Design a protein around this ligand. Structure first.
Ligand SMILES: N[C@H]1CO[C@H](OP(=O)(O)OP(=O)(O)OC[C@H]2O[C@@H](n3ccc(=O)[nH]c3=O)[C@H](O)[C@@H]2O)[C@H](O)[C@H]1O
Ligand SMILES: Cc1ccc(/N=C/[C@@H]2CNC3=NC(N)=NC(=O)C3N2C=O)cc1
Length: 302
């Protein structure tokens, strides 16, 4: 079976890895260029393809006609997206007779959209999953071919959850790809009244507002802990990042209760800044972070 593939990130790499094991011919892979703001810790889909002799591109707009045209000539039987970031129109999606699929890290139709890895940790979800589905004009909405559910633990952060999502993702593809290759899918439409959609995330989305409950602020620390861009606050004009934290069950919110442990009063309870860095400084424990910041007992953040 012949395939053209749209992939990036660790999921991109495992997807391609799974396609090749299961015995497909990946005729070409589309991907993206890396960006300076996003710590690139993950597998490179472009290195993967080169490694295996597959043609690889990263056009900013795959939906431009010339690209539609090169894709149509490759005669993809099936189309696979694994963690690609832009929409692929119905023109490219129609070109595959056996159809097109996407692999997505959520219990669809919950957490459609972007960065569900991170969104579920922000919202303090106790479980999540991986879904493989028909890829249609409308984002993350086509019929579900398979789904594997996995539990989020309280001590989990973005990096630990991501490796569980990838582990789950590879299994899903072992449990799915032969069936797709042979012509044997139970696809079920997604239930629209259950659906949720969460949008694009930026570093600025992890600003810490200390009027919130601590466990809310703690779940933001967890959702973008390193290698994500880190939840942050300010001391004066000084930005500083909270890399890891701990909820500790009469100081007003955003006030430094103690500086060792470095403990900030929130709206409800208190959050311990276990580790953090000031501006572009090195990472340190919280007691040291205070000293560098000039924080004292009773200091006010924004
Ligand atoms: N099917 C979806 C599955 O999740 C992917 O998320 P993504 O890989 O993070 O990619 P993206 O949404 O584009 O977001 C990444 C950008 O967003 C930044 N980001 C991501 C999460 C977050 O919590 N904060 C943040 O700033 C990253 O640093 C980077 O700049 C894709 O959204 C879809 O493929
Ligand atoms: C705002 C936004 C923008 C893009 C997006 N997902 C893009 C990604 C990549 N390309 C896709 N192509 C198609 N035709 N359908 C999909 O569901 C797609 N996606 C599914 O993960 C999700 C939300």
């Amino acid at each position: 079976m012949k395939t053209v593939v749209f992939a990036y990130h660790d999921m991109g790499c495992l997807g391609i890895e799974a396609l090749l094991a299961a015995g497909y011919e990946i005729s070409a892979i589309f991907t993206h260029t890396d960006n300076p703001g996003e710590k690139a810790f993950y597998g490179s889909v472009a290195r993967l393809a080169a490694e295996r002799g597959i043609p690889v591109y990263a056009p900013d707009n795959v939906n431009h006609p010339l690209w539609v045209e090169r894709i149509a000539q490759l005669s993809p039987d099936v189309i696979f997206s694994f963690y690609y970031r832009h929409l692929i129109y119905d023109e490219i999606l129609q070109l595959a007779p056996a159809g097109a699929f996407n692999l997505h890290g959520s219990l669809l139709p919950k957490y459609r959209g972007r960065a569900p890895l991170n969104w579920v940790l922000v919202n303090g979800e106790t479980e999540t999953g991986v879904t493989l589905h028909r890829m249609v004009k409308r984002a993350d909405a086509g019929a579900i071919v398979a789904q594997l559910r996995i539990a989020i633990a309280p001590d989990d952060i973005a990096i630990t959850l991501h490796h569980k999502l990838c582990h789950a993702a590879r299994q899903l593809l072992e449990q799915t790809l032969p069936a797709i290759k042979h012509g044997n899918i139970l696809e079920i439409a997604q239930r629209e009244n259950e659906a949720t959609c969460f949008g694009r995330r930026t570093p600025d989305d992890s600003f810490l507002e200390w009027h919130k409950p601590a466990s809310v602020l703690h779940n933001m620390v967890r959702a973008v802990a390193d290698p994500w861009p880190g939840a942050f606050s300010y001391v004066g004009n000084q930005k500083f990042t909270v890399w890891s934290s701990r909820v500790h069950p009469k100081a007003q919110p955003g006030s430094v209760i103690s500086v060792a442990p470095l403990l900030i009063a929130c709206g409800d309870g208190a959050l311990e800044i276990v580790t953090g860095q000031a501006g572009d400084g090195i990472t340190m424990q919280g007691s040291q972070l205070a000293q560098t910041l000039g924080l004292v007992q009773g200091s006010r953040l924004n």
